[PDB]
C-alpha positions as MATLAB code, in Angstrom:
seq = 'XXXXXXXXXXXXXXXXXXXXXXXXXXXXXXXXXXXXXXXXXXXXXXXXXXXXXXXX';
ca = [
       0.000    0.000    0.000;
       2.768    2.429    0.984;
       4.675    1.704   -2.223;
       1.492    2.424   -4.161;
       0.743    5.735   -2.437;
       4.363    6.763   -2.934;
       4.096    5.893   -6.637;
       0.740    7.680   -6.763;
       2.364   10.919   -5.650;
       5.504   10.551   -7.764;
       3.292   10.094  -10.816;
       1.665   13.413   -9.924;
       5.086   15.070   -9.832;
       5.863   13.664  -13.269;
       2.458   14.833  -14.484;
       3.249   18.330  -13.221;
       6.569   18.199  -15.061;
       4.657   17.449  -18.265;
       2.121   20.222  -17.671;
       4.818   22.893  -17.667;
       6.698   21.708  -20.749;
       9.701   20.283  -18.899;
       9.070   16.736  -20.119;
       8.126   15.574  -23.605;
       5.455   12.904  -24.077;
       8.059   10.180  -24.605;
      10.093   11.266  -21.564;
       6.996   11.250  -19.357;
       6.092    7.795  -20.683;
       9.589    6.412  -20.023;
       9.691    7.885  -16.515;
       6.292    6.401  -15.667;
       7.400    2.980  -16.910;
      10.657    3.200  -14.935;
       8.750    4.237  -11.810;
       6.381    1.285  -12.122;
       9.192   -1.192  -12.808;
      11.064   -0.061   -9.690;
       7.848   -0.077   -7.637;
       7.138   -3.628   -8.817;
      10.627   -4.711   -7.764;
      10.032   -3.091   -4.366;
       6.774   -4.966   -3.791;
       8.441   -8.238   -4.842;
      11.221   -7.680   -2.312;
       8.614   -6.727    0.300;
       6.604   -9.912   -0.301;
       9.685  -12.084    0.037;
      11.044  -10.172    3.053;
       7.676  -10.446    4.800;
       7.730  -14.184    4.135;
      11.349  -14.568    5.270;
      10.907  -12.637    8.515;
       7.332  -13.421    9.562;
       6.215  -16.630    7.822;
       9.284  -18.719    6.917;
];
């Protein structure tokens, strides 16, 4: 949930950056994809760490 909310705000930042002509469409796209890839990795690691520590 945390990792989602985090993402959900970072997205907004990126969106802002696109509103004011700092990012092109492609750049925004790439940054969103990168963000979601990293987030996905984080939730994977969180799943496995939760298993390892609490339910081995």
